Structure prediction request, 256 residues.
Amino acid sequence: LEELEQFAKTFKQRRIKLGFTQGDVGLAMGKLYGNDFSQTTISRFEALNLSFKNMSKLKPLLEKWLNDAERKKRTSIETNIRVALEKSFLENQKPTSEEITMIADQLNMEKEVIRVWFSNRRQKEKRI
Amino acid sequence: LEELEQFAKTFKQRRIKLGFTQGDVGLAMGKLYGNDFSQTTISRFEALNLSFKNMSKLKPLLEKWLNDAERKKRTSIETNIRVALEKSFLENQKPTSEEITMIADQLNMEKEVIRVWFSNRRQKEKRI
DNA sequence: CACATTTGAAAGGCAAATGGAG
DNA sequence: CTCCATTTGCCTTTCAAATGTG
Prediction:
């Protein structure tokens, strides 16, 4: 709705006038509010490329920062490790908890990360 | 050449292992070597997209940082200011230094930023 | 100045993490 | 757990802001 898209528009203006980059914001946002956001989120926000609900929930967080102004970190799966996981995935798309423990161990990755990786991978497989 | 990439593909590894993002290295580099470096660069480095000569330059200070660890800020431009600048460019594409100072003062931009804007805008016109 | 190159803010693709229901 | 949807960010890439050359 308008009451939402407008703010996005106003925000970018002030942000820019304030000398800040979507990055600068998302970073001071984490200190000034404890949370933590990425340049990608802020960009996505000033652009209404967030869900109506994501936008909604986010707007206030920003309303505070502008006025003032005026979650596990994403694991990076390295090539070597993906190749191993794709392979293991072609062998078995649904390894069990333990098979997951062996895979995690064998790779020196946290059981949980591995568990999610497989789940995401099946989800991937399901799209086409 | 090969002598080079071998620091590229290496650095990435060392980076990722050390627990750092291209952006993290950017932030870091901005303090230590006290120079100026954006994630787009660090990405371009590791990906070897940096022009021969250039790539060659960078390497050393990254190497410096890595081993150690082991310019004017780009002015962003409001849509509106831009539609104004653009409107102005249609009226006269080569404003005089005084007309520039006037425009800068009106929009609340640096005289230089505005001079450049018009030269780039002229260049952009020369590419078709 | 014109023109060529460098370099970064912002945006897009792919997926890691999270959350609701069975 | 899972499945499936959704949030969220790392890394990449576009366009132009900035620098460099003649």
Helices of chain A lie at 2-17, 22-32, 39-46, 52-69, 79-91, 97-107, 111-125. The interface with chain B takes residues 12-13, 16-17, 21, 76, 78 of chain A (CB under 8 Å). The radius of gyration of chain A is 20 Å. Residues 19 and 32 of chain A are 17 Å apart (CA to CA).
